[PDB]
């Protein structure tokens, strides 16, 4: 539906949609921009990420509300209210899965294969792990282990590149480690791995802060605080 709009106009309108808090529109504009077939700049990658994270974030929050109601409905002593809670949870779940599949499809056709610089490749592989992780959050059936392993594999490739090619304070490296640590804690039932990763990431970043400008220091320490927040919650 965006095929007739100029790439630059799609990017301009994505920024307007962000200012207006119209994240579904923002995501549709950025999908159109990706589908023009050119690589994305750093700024454009962050617009793509902001848009879809906000869309899926609303869906995930709604899914958790509905899942909790459904859980309470199946406790002993609960009155039978019919199929409606399950149906509506399933409706929201299917829409969420559709958004994840859309993002994964953009990554596979063809953002990842054309991404050669570490900053872009790690960014996209982190995104791939993230959207498999969101699929894992709602998965219950025969492919659940494979969904979890797909998240793990994408995160692991991103980590390997990030450790070789980026300083320990790089914000993409830090955000990747934050999210892989959450994956370990919440998805893979590996809280010790989650804690170890968060701590090592924090400590290695701390030791590299001395190399940074004031502005880079602000960027890196903001994400380090997110790691610390999780360590405080988990220990």
């Amino acid at each position: 539906a965006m095929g007739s709009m100029e790439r630059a106009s799609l990017i301009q309108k994505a920024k307007l949609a962000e200012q207006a808090e119209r994240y579904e529109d923002m995501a549709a504009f950025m999908k159109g921009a990706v589908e023009k077939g050119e690589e994305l700049s750093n700024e454009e990658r962050n617009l793509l990420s902001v848009a879809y994270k906000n869309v899926v974030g609303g869906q995930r929050a709604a899914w958790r509300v509905l899942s909790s109601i459904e859980q309470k409905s199946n406790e002993e002593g609960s009155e039978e209210k019919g199929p409606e809670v399950r149906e509506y949870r399933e409706k929201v779940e299917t829409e969420l899965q559709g958004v994840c599949d859309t993002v994964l499809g953009l990554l596979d056709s063809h953002l990842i294969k054309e991404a050669g610089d570490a900053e872009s490749r790690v960014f996209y592989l982190k995104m791939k792990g993230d959207y498999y992780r969101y699929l894992a959050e709602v998965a219950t059936g025969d492919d659940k282990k494979r969904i979890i392993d797909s998240a793990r594999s994408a995160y692991q490739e991103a980590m390997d590149i990030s450790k070789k090619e980026m300083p320990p304070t790089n914000p993409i490296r830090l955000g990747l480690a934050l999210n892989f640590s959450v994956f370990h804690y919440e998805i893979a039932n590996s809280p010790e791995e989650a804690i170890s990763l968060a701590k090592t990431t924090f400590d290695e970043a701390m030791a590299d802060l001395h190399t940074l400008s004031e502005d880079s220091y602000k960027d890196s320490t903001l994400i380090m605080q997110l790691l610390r927040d999780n360590l405080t919650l988990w220990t």
Partner: peptide, 8 residues
């Protein structure tokens, strides 16, 4: 009280 992931 909800753990943090990479957002904004």
């Amino acid at each position: 009280r909800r753990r943090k992931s990479c957002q904004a």
